[PDB]
Amino acid sequence: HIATVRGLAVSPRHPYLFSCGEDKMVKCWDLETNKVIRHYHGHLSGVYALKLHPTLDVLVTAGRDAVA
Amino acid sequence: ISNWKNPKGYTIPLDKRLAADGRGLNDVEINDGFAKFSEALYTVERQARE
Amino acid sequence: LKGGAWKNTEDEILKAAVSKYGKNQWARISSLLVRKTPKQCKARWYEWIDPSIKKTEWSREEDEKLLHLAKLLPTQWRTIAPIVGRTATQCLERYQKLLDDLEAKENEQLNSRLRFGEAEPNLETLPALPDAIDMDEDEKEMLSEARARLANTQGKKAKRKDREKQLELTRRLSHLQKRREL
Amino acid sequence: NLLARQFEGRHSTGVAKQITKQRVDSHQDLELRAAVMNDILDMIPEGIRQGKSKTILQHLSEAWRCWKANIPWKVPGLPAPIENMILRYVKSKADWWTSVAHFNRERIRRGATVDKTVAKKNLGRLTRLWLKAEQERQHNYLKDGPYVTADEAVAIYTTFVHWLESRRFQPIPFPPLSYKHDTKLLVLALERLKEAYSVKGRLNQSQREELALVEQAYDNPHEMLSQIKRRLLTMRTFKEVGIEFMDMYSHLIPVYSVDPMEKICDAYLDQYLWFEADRRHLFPSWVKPSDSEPPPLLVYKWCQGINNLTDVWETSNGECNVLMETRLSKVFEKVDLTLLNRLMSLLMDTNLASYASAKNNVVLSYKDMSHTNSYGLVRGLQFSSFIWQFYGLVLDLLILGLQRATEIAGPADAPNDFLHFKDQATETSHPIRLYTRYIDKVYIMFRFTDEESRDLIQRFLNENPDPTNSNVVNYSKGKKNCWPRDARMRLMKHDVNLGRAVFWEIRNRLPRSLTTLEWEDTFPSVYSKDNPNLLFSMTGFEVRILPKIRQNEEFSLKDGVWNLTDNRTKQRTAQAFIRVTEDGINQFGNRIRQILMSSGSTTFTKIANKWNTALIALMTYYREAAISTPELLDLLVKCESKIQTRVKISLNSKMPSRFPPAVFYSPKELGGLGMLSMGHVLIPQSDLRWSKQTDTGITHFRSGMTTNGEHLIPNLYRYIQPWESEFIDSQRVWAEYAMKRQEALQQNRRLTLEDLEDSWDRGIPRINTLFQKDRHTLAYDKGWRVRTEFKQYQLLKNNPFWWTSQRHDGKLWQLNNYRVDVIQALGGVEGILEHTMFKATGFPSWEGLFWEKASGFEESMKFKKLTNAQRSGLNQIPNRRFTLWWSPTINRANVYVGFQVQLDLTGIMMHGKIPTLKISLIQIFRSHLWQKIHESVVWDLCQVLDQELESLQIETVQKETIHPRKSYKMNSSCADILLLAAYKWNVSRPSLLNDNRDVLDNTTTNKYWIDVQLRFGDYDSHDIERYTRAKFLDYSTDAQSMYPSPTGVLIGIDLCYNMHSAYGNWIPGMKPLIQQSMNKIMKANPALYVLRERIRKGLQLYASE
Amino acid sequence: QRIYNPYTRTSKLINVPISKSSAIQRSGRAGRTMRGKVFRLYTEKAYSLMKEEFEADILNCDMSPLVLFLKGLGLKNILQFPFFVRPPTVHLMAALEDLYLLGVLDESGNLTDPLGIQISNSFLDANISKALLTSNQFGCTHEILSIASILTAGEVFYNPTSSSKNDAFVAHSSFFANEGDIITALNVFESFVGNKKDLQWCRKNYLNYQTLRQALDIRTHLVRFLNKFSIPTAQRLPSSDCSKILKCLLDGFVRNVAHLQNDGSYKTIGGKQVWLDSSSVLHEKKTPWIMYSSAVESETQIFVKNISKIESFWLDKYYKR
Amino acid sequence: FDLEPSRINQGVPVWKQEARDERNRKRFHGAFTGGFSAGYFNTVGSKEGWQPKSWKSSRNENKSVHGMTIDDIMDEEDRADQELSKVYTSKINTIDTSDSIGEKMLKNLGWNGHDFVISPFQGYYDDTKLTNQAYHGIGYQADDVFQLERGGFGSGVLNDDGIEDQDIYDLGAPKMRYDKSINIT
RNA sequence: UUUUUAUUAAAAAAUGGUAUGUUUUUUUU
RNA sequence: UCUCUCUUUGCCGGCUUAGAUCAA
């Protein structure tokens, strides 16, 4: 991460670890290899929170651009 | 009131600029051990000379 | 060239420039005084000019403190000065004055510095020279420059935007006037 | 994507932009400001006029700036919650700032960055952090009192007094008015201050002021002598002293800037004190550096002294040698000023001591940060060298003791030699045999018997018990890993315990309040029956001494191996293996790295001069040490290759074909860069499996920098004599000079030159220096070596030759055969000039010519204020001249890759882009020169045909109005001057203008035409005979041809080499006519003339005097 | 004081210890009205060594006018004249060789043609007089006469030390001639007489009227001098082409030619390094070929005055004949 | 050509003079004058263009086809430096400067000097090789320790000089800096 | 005790050097 | 209850190597 990390979430159905930071990008660390595999890019400013849907394979992020 | 820059002219009188500092909170005192140290140096210096 | 004796006009321009600029822009301040360098301006401000300096007469308490400290730390006036409260030059001058006064009273009931001439005074610690009635012509011009300097403000290139607005106002007024005369 | 953007639009709105290492700071600031806005909006309760965010943000910015400048930042009217939040966020920002500083400095030290901006930013951060730490240290010193106790100060003063009275030291007096040598000391100080500058125009206000003061001193010196003495007597407070750090990319050197007049006074006091101390014998021989030897000779003397100790190498009865190198860890920082003043009062007059003590208590200021130096020692003063030298003679007395110091130094009237004793009884009476102090590093040599060593280890293990045998886990901190093991220290338990015991004892010898010894800086190397070789590191050299007793192995006596003799038996007893320490290799690497990124490295000549200076400074210090080090050789190859790569990059092409070694290594007067070379050598290799564990024979050679073709660029080391031969020659020459001086004194004859002509430039203090013009002034300049070493704390420019001075030592290196050898190696002057554009200038011979350094126009604009673009172009001018000079080889035709494009209105064919060469060639042809030249040549041809207007083929002759662009089009060429014959002739195959046995009776032809084409030849293909042959055989035989006659004549001109030729069918009369007329033409055209003169103007290559 | 160098035709202002007579005069200067004291800043032992009386100006000036005077009286051999102090022989031969190359003296050392005698009759130097005497062949005597009057009278421009210097430049800004200072002076003189001799105009233009009046007297007396030889003085060039005036000047300043060097200095025809004075307009114009009149030499640089540009082919055609 | 407005220079000598302006603009042009553009616009051609003239030779029509001359193909810089570079002839200046015909002149003067005669002006010409004084007094003896008095391309006129820029190949000062003998006692 | 073999590269754009901003009407009653 | 005046009256561009340098 380039800047401060603001949210972590260990997926209970996948071997992943999603993270987000004030550096405007969301990452998906693969815990079987300890390397970033996915990047989620659309955000106009820093991201302050991150959560995972308990059932669906969908994650939700909220940030400084007044948009979740 | 900053000691470095201001975008406009905005002249500030010297008293206000002086009042914006922490100089008073920082004490200026010297340890007691200097008094015995220097005197010892002065004592032996005279003793060796005599 | 550069230097001199810090006439009163220079000192007051220095005070005004410090008021308008701050204590961390000595290069910009020295641009006002063409005969002085930023180091000289800083030395004078921190040795004679800034209001924190106590120019009053020496009390007995601080005098005994000065004697005690000068006994404790031989030389080392730059560190004795903050404790005593005066500047280093003031403390050293007061110490020498006390020693000379004691020698004078020594003579009533009864050379190393003598073999050479008197100590040339430091330029930044001497009192400002009182101004004459007609301060030459160069000092007048530098005072005028400083006067225009202190009330400039408005940045540097902000004089373009307002000028373009005034020109646009004149052009539109002329256009409306031509429409009206038609 | 291109078509979508074309038919749709930008769709700029609603797109995100990733942070890309340049927006990092400006985005972190935005996030911090947003967070502070949220905190403000929260902690302020309801209905309290929330519109107060901007002022708190201003307070936060001011608090951050105050933190950076180390200012308290107490705001009186600020509420407590706001103040606490601001403090918290400022601490967060400060911690981020410091972490980034650490990361960037580590990266810079490794070498992973080449930014100038990053290096400067990190230098600023390091300066700020160090100054904060130093201010805290001084404040703590004032709070906690004098760290040195009263008892320690009394003991130190008593020992120094006893030592000084034992050697009957006569205290230095204040210099009287009637002092004979004042003018000489003054001029010496003034010269040392002038040596810092040049006649360049970059002098700022302070530099110009000090130069003017120096000039005023030269015009009339005596009133300034009076002023200097008066200031010494009366002045006790001084101006502020600027402070800044000089980046070595591995450590930072503190550089102090002092006021000019105070600098004059300090320099005079320095000279006077060093002359008086040397005249009165204050420093007892073992303090270093000294005027006697350079550092390499000091290493040699240490090796010889170690070898010459009595029974030094014998290990039968359990005797052990410990040679402990160490440095006094933080010893300049712990020099108590009052104790220093009391000590300095012992050596000299009270006035001088007081002046020197008060000069060290100054106000150090960097930018907006300032503090009062009241505890440390300021190394930027001109006399700080002397002040440190006698404060470090105190520590020598503490370490050795008065009796051992007296034994080592000997009687004051008859002092001992450097590393010798009066007799063996006193030499062997103490474990300490040898001792020296190089500024702050201490080298001691211990000679223990069995009982002494056993008792020492038992004492050490009493107080530091070692049940787990952990004393051997971390002993050599990778210090001596350069040597192959079995040449390192074998970590036997007894030897390791002995070394650690010696370190423990010596460290306990010194009080902790003024200095300390760190184990990470100390390495005691033991010689015993277990390990045979002593190892130590003096200055930049790593030395390994292996006595002949313990060798039991045969190795080739390299040039980098010193043979140590024994004066008792006059035979060699040990061999010392010399190599460059890892710190020296890093220093050279960092020096090259800081050469590459610098303001002046824009011009090729400047960077070549920088490379030459760095290379000479390296290879004259470690003469043969740098040869025995295989790591330094590959570093030299790498750094020379990257120096060349800088020049290659500046011309926007780093192809190796474009840059033969003649471009870089040819001497300056021939138009090259004049680069000294050492990366052009083979690097020895041996099997890597046994390279780390034993010294195996050199079985393979890995090539160094490759030279395309067969070229042998001379090595620089082969023109520098190795240190050992210089030392042997010095001893022999000085002994014979002493003998001849004695034979001159026994009679009344005056010793003269042409009597020492054989040993003229020989001896480390060169014999030249005896008959020197200014040897009388130099006879008073003393302590110059320590002063030159300490000059690193006063000037921001690195002194490469810090270890020597040409006035006192003489020119120790004489590299003049390198020029002639590198001229021969490249193929001679003719072979070098075939690459350049010398022929196009039309100059008759090379001997008379000379280059003009500046065009005068440059001299006009060297002070005027110019925009950055104008300064860049003015700097590019010499690069453009250089590129034009080497045009034939840089714009060659045998290139690996490159689009072949023709310059418009011109026949020059460009491979690649190379903007510098293109713009130079455009300037050379700034008007329509190519086509004008073609028309002028054909015009002069028609005139000379008008002369001979009555000949064969005179029935018709006409030169057609050709297509304009027929000069600069080689795809096809239209006709030229036409000839048709009135009768029939017999001609044969066309031939050149060189053959007289030419048959012309094979075929029967009637008509011919003559045409001329212009060629700008390059280095690879310039033989005009083949060019004209092929052009004729291609153009005439071509199925499409706008030449009326089936056969004719084609002639060519090589503009770059001003040659010419022809090929065509010949009719008697025409061939001799063109032979006689072409030569007259080629020296007569206005067009060729103006082309030659404009080329000469561009090259700035003028004729003879 | 001033010392002139014949080998280089330069003049320098050098410091010299005073003579004994000068010291006595300075001591006696004080004490006219009441008793006075002198404090000479040296020792009597220093006084014991200086030479008694300063050497004569006949021994410290240019003898070319002197040789013209004697040759006009009819003295073939210069050694026959009763000099009080013998002048330097090397100076006499230098002046005579200069006069020979000027054409006033023949191979035998006698006055050449009416030219030599007419030059002898002229008060001015032979160099300036040659242009005046040859101007009759070209019908442009008037402007060369004005040039000579300006040169002999002195500097016709006044340079204040205060801010009016910028005003002076602006006052001069109307009359900057591309061809050098000499034609600028000609234009200034023409408009000066064309401005009714108005003294307020001279104040406004910062022009020295006294020098212009003296030039008027000089030109009137030289008009009488030419009329002594029955030479008309109504000859003016009706065309703007100043080239033939420049031919006459190059005939008058044959020795004083120089061409620009790359270093910013100029190479005299005699291989001398000289520097242009800052006063001249063509200070940085980088004119390829230049012609000057007077040379004043300082401790480092030799400065030339009265700068005027020239063309190479005029010089080439003049030297070949 | 109005020489442009000359008031811009005023005083303010070299090290404060703004920058040279070709067209009252702060720019450089020419490859060897510091500009990043040479020719018309980084090109050889010109604004109008350039065409050859008609050619015709018939032993009487080529007579109208004259030769080529120096000036017709050069430009303003080329002619300027052609004027600058013309230096030759000289002769007479070198003969009588620095005596020959002057010896005949001395024959006219009836020199008959035998032993030559000199004047105190020549002692002042010796003063040309003595001093100009250095602001000192008459009796000031001064001091002797305080008196003082290869090629290739250039490093750049703004890159200055230093220890870096000297000749590594040195063979000067053969004997002029060295004494021929030294007192031993 | 006879013989060896080992071969990096490599050019284009923007920074970077003729800034930029301005600029013409068909209805009144 | 008007008019005027005074006084009380809580009060409504950022970042970095101070960005970097500076003699008529």
Tokens coding C13: 């321009």
> Quick one: how many helices (H) and strands (E) in chain B?
2, 0
Q: Which residues pair with D751 in a beta bridge?
A: F182
* Nearest alpha carbon to residue D938 among F62, C62, E129: F62
Query: With 0-12 CB in 10 A as exposed, 13-18 as middle and 19+ as buried, what is C48?
Result: buried
Please provide residue D369's backbone torsions phi and psi, each rounded to the nearest 5 degrees.
Answer: -90, 140
Chain F environment of E316 (Cβ under 8 Å): 86, 89
Nucleotide nearest to D204 (CA to C1'): H23
F143-176 burial: b if 16+ Cβ within 10 Å, else e: eeebeeeeebbbbbbbbbebebbeebbeeeeeee
**A20 DSSP 8-state letter:** E
Is residue C8 helix, strand or coil? Answer: helix
- Do residues D399 and D442 make contact, with C-beta atoms less than 8 angstroms apart? yes
* Nearest alpha carbon to residue D1047 among D996, D963, D986, D995: D986
Tokens coding C33: 């005084």
Amino acid at D388: W
Q: Which residues pair with D575 in a beta bridge?
A: D546, D563
Tokens coding D264: 């004059």
Q: What is the CA radius of gyration of chain A?
A: 11
Distance of CA D48 to the CA centre of its chain: 65
* Spatial separation of the C-alpha atoms in residues E170 and E214, rounded to whole Å: 25
* Nearest alpha carbon to residue D543 among D482, D631, D617: D482
- Do residues D957 and D945 make contact, with C-beta atoms less than 8 angstroms apart? yes
Chain-chain contact of D881 with F153 (C-beta, under 8 angstroms): yes
- CA-to-CA dists, residue E226 to E114, E121, E212, angstroms: 12, 10, 21
Whether E and B touch (3+ CB pairs < 8 Å), yes or no: no
Q: What is the 3-state secondary structure (H, E, C) of B28-41?
A: CCCCCHHHHHHHHH
For residue B34, the chain C residue with the least C-alpha distance is: C72
* Nearest alpha carbon to residue D542 among D478, D495, D634: D478
Whether E and D touch (3+ CB pairs < 8 Å), yes or no: yes
Is residue C127 helix, strand or coil? Answer: coil
Is residue E241 helix, strand or coil? Answer: coil
Q: What kind of experiment solved this structure?
A: cryo-EM
Distance of CA E112 to the CA centre of its chain: 23
Tokens coding E259: 């061409």
F35 interface with D at CB cutoff 8 Å: yes
Is residue E273 helix, strand or coil? Answer: strand
Tokens coding D681: 């050598």
* Nearest alpha carbon to residue D256 among D134, D419, D408, D395: D134
Amino acid at C1: L
Please provide residue D176's backbone torsions phi and psi, each rounded to the nearest 5 degrees.
Answer: -65, 170
Those chains having 3 or more beta-carbon pairs within 8 angstroms of chain B are C, D
**D1008 DSSP 8-state letter:** E
Residue F38 contacts by C-beta under 8 Å, 6 or more apart in sequence? D919, D920, D922, D923, D926, F29, F30, F31
| Cα–Cα–Cα angle for D125, D127, D132, rounded to 5 degrees | 95
- Do residues D1081 and D934 make contact, with C-beta atoms less than 8 angstroms apart? no
Instruction: Report resolution in angstroms.
Output: 3.2
Element holding D535 (H helix, E strand): strand D534-538
Chain E environment of D856 (Cβ under 8 Å): 261-264
| Cα–Cα–Cα angle for D798, D799, D803, rounded to 5 degrees | 140
* Nearest alpha carbon to residue E97 among E106, E88, E87: E106
List strands edge to edge, sheet with E266-268: E294-297, E302-305, E273-276, E266-268, E257-260, E289-291, E308-309
Neighbours of D452 (CB within 10 A): 14
Question: Which nucleotides of chain G have an atom under 7 angstroms from any protein CB?
Answer: 6-13, 16-18
Tokens coding E149: 């009057």
- Do residues D896 and F14 make contact, with C-beta atoms less than 8 angstroms apart? no
Element holding A38 (H helix, E strand): strand A35-40
Amino acid at E266: Y
* Nearest alpha carbon to residue B3 among E298, D442, D637, C25: C25
Any atom of strand G under 7 A from CB of D869?
A: yes
Is residue D42 helix, strand or coil? Answer: helix
Straight-line distance from the first to the last Cα atom of chain B, in angstroms, rounded to the nearest whole number: 61
Amino acid at D493: K
Q: Please count the CA atoms within 13 angstroms of the CA of D743 that sit on its side-chain side.
A: 8
Chain-chain contact of D811 with F170 (C-beta, under 8 angstroms): yes
* Spatial separation of the C-alpha atoms in residues D503 and D322, rounded to whole Å: 10
Amino acid at D96: W
Among the partner-chain residues B34, B41, B45, the one whose CB lies closest to the CB of D145 is: B34
Q: Tokens 């009265």 — which residue?
A: E306
Amino acid at D520: E
Which residues in C have their CB inside 8 Å of a CB on D?
A: 2, 24, 37, 39, 42-43, 73-79, 82, 88-89, 92, 112-113, 115-117, 119-120, 122
Residue D1022 contacts by C-beta under 8 Å, 6 or more apart in sequence? D888, D1054, D1056, D1057, D1059
Q: Which residues pair with D448 in a beta bridge?
A: D320
> Is the previous residue joined to D173 through a cis bond, with omega within 30 degrees of 0?
no
Element holding A8 (H helix, E strand): strand A5-10
- Do residues D807 and D774 make contact, with C-beta atoms less than 8 angstroms apart? yes
Those chains having 3 or more beta-carbon pairs within 8 angstroms of chain D are A, B, C, E, F
* Nearest alpha carbon to residue D1047 among D978, D1099, D963: D978
- Do residues F34 and D873 make contact, with C-beta atoms less than 8 angstroms apart? yes
* Spatial separation of the C-alpha atoms in residues E157 and E285, rounded to whole Å: 21
Query: With 0-12 CB in 10 A as exposed, 13-18 as middle and 19+ as buried, what is D967?
Result: buried
Is residue D230 helix, strand or coil? Answer: helix
Residue E209 contacts by C-beta under 8 Å, 6 or more apart in sequence? E197, E199, E202
* Spatial separation of the C-alpha atoms in residues D164 and D346, rounded to whole Å: 9
* Spatial separation of the C-alpha atoms in residues D334 and D68, rounded to whole Å: 26
Is residue F25 helix, strand or coil? Answer: coil
Q: Which residues pair with D832 in a beta bridge?
A: none
Q: Work out whether the CA dihedral C78, C82, C88, C91 comes out positive or negative.
A: negative
- Do residues D372 and C77 make contact, with C-beta atoms less than 8 angstroms apart? no
* Spatial separation of the C-alpha atoms in residues D319 and D549, rounded to whole Å: 15
Please provide residue D328's backbone torsions phi and psi, each rounded to the nearest 5 degrees.
Answer: -65, 110
Tokens coding D621: 């210090």
Neighbours of D96 (CB within 10 A): 14
* Nearest alpha carbon to residue D401 among D159, D168, D165, D164: D159
- Do residues D52 and D40 make contact, with C-beta atoms less than 8 angstroms apart? yes
Q: Please count the CA atoms within 13 angstroms of the CA of D157 that sit on its side-chain side.
A: 28
Q: What is the four-CA torsion angle of D943, D948, D950, D954, rounded to 10 degrees? A: -60
* Spatial separation of the C-alpha atoms in residues D140 and D138, rounded to whole Å: 5
Element holding A63 (H helix, E strand): strand A59-63
Q: Tokens 């045409």 — which residue?
A: D1011
* Spatial separation of the C-alpha atoms in residues D766 and D769, rounded to whole Å: 6
Q: Which residues pair with E77 in a beta bridge?
A: none
| Cα–Cα–Cα angle for F159, F164, F169, rounded to 5 degrees | 130
Amino acid at E316: D
Check residues 1055 to 1084 of chain D and report those whose beta carbon is under 7 Å from nucleic acid strand G: none
Is residue D1067 helix, strand or coil? Answer: coil
Nucleotide nearest to C38 (CA to C1'): H22
* Nearest alpha carbon to residue D365 among D64, D63, D131, D130: D131
* Spatial separation of the C-alpha atoms in residues D793 and D770, rounded to whole Å: 32
- Do residues D440 and D391 make contact, with C-beta atoms less than 8 angstroms apart? no
* Spatial separation of the C-alpha atoms in residues D417 and D430, rounded to whole Å: 18
Residue D81 contacts by C-beta under 8 Å, 6 or more apart in sequence? D43
**C122 DSSP 8-state letter:** P
Chain F window 78-107: which residues touch E at a Cβ cutoff of 8 Å? 80, 83-84, 86-87, 89-90, 92-93, 96-99, 101-102, 104-106
- Do residues F139 and E45 make contact, with C-beta atoms less than 8 angstroms apart? yes
Among the partner-chain residues D76, D148, D342, the one whose CB lies closest to the CB of B45 is: D342
Tokens coding D57: 């943000």
* Spatial separation of the C-alpha atoms in residues D285 and D418, rounded to whole Å: 6
Angle D350-359/D222-234 helices, nearest 10 degrees?
Answer: 80
- Do residues D40 and D56 make contact, with C-beta atoms less than 8 angstroms apart? yes
Q: Which residues pair with D572 in a beta bridge?
A: D565
Residue numbers followed by a gap, chain B, C–N over 2.5 Å = none
Straight-line distance from the first to the last Cα atom of chain F, in angstroms, rounded to the nearest whole number: 78
Whether D and A touch (3+ CB pairs < 8 Å), yes or no: yes
* Spatial separation of the C-alpha atoms in residues F62 and F43, rounded to whole Å: 34
Amino acid at A17: L
* Spatial separation of the C-alpha atoms in residues D810 and D733, rounded to whole Å: 15
Neighbours of D711 (CB within 10 A): 15
D870-899 burial: b if 16+ Cβ within 10 Å, else e: bbebbbbbbbbbbbbbbbbbbbbeeeeeee
Residue D296 contacts by C-beta under 8 Å, 6 or more apart in sequence? D539, D541, D621, D622, D623, D723, D803
Query: With 0-12 CB in 10 A as exposed, 13-18 as middle and 19+ as buried, what is E9?
Result: buried
Element holding D243 (H helix, E strand): strand D241-247
* Spatial separation of the C-alpha atoms in residues D201 and F19, rounded to whole Å: 17
- DSSP assignment of D141-152 equals HHHH--SS-HHH
* Nearest alpha carbon to residue E72 among E106, E120, E118, E116: E120
Element holding D536 (H helix, E strand): strand D534-538
Q: Tokens 């820059």 — which residue?
A: B5
* Spatial separation of the C-alpha atoms in residues D803 and D790, rounded to whole Å: 11
Tokens coding E21: 């007579």
- CA-to-CA dists, residue D408 to D161, D323, D396, angstroms: 18, 17, 12
Which residues in B have their CB inside 8 Å of a CB on C?
A: 2-6, 8-9, 11-15, 17-18, 28-30, 34-35, 38
- CA-to-CA dists, residue D532 to C93, D206, D456, angstroms: 66, 57, 21
DSSP H stretches of helix in D676-765: 723-745
* Spatial separation of the C-alpha atoms in residues D276 and D270, rounded to whole Å: 10
For residue D164, the chain B residue with the least C-alpha distance is: B48
* Nearest alpha carbon to residue D409 among D302, D304, D286, D324: D286
D624-635 burial: b if 16+ Cβ within 10 Å, else e: bbbbbbeebbeb
- CA-to-CA dists, residue D882 to C48, D28, E189, F156, angstroms: 58, 47, 53, 12
* Spatial separation of the C-alpha atoms in residues D592 and F82, rounded to whole Å: 46
- Do residues E309 and F3 make contact, with C-beta atoms less than 8 angstroms apart? no
* Nearest alpha carbon to residue D589 among D635, D621, D633: D635
Greatest CA separation for chain A = 34
Element holding D494 (H helix, E strand): helix D493-508
Straight-line distance from the first to the last Cα atom of chain E, in angstroms, rounded to the nearest whole number: 40
Tokens coding D856: 């005068």
Tokens coding E139: 């019908």
- CA-to-CA dists, residue D559 to D575, D721, E119, angstroms: 12, 10, 85
**E285 DSSP 8-state letter:** S
Distance of CA D450 to the CA centre of its chain: 49
For an interface test with D, the pick among A23, A26, A40, A41 (most D C-beta atoms closer than 10 Å) comes out as: A23
> Quick one: how many helices (H) and strands (E) in chain C?
8, 0
Neighbours of D672 (CB within 10 A): 26
* Spatial separation of the C-alpha atoms in residues E320 and F1, rounded to whole Å: 33
* Spatial separation of the C-alpha atoms in residues E215 and E212, rounded to whole Å: 5
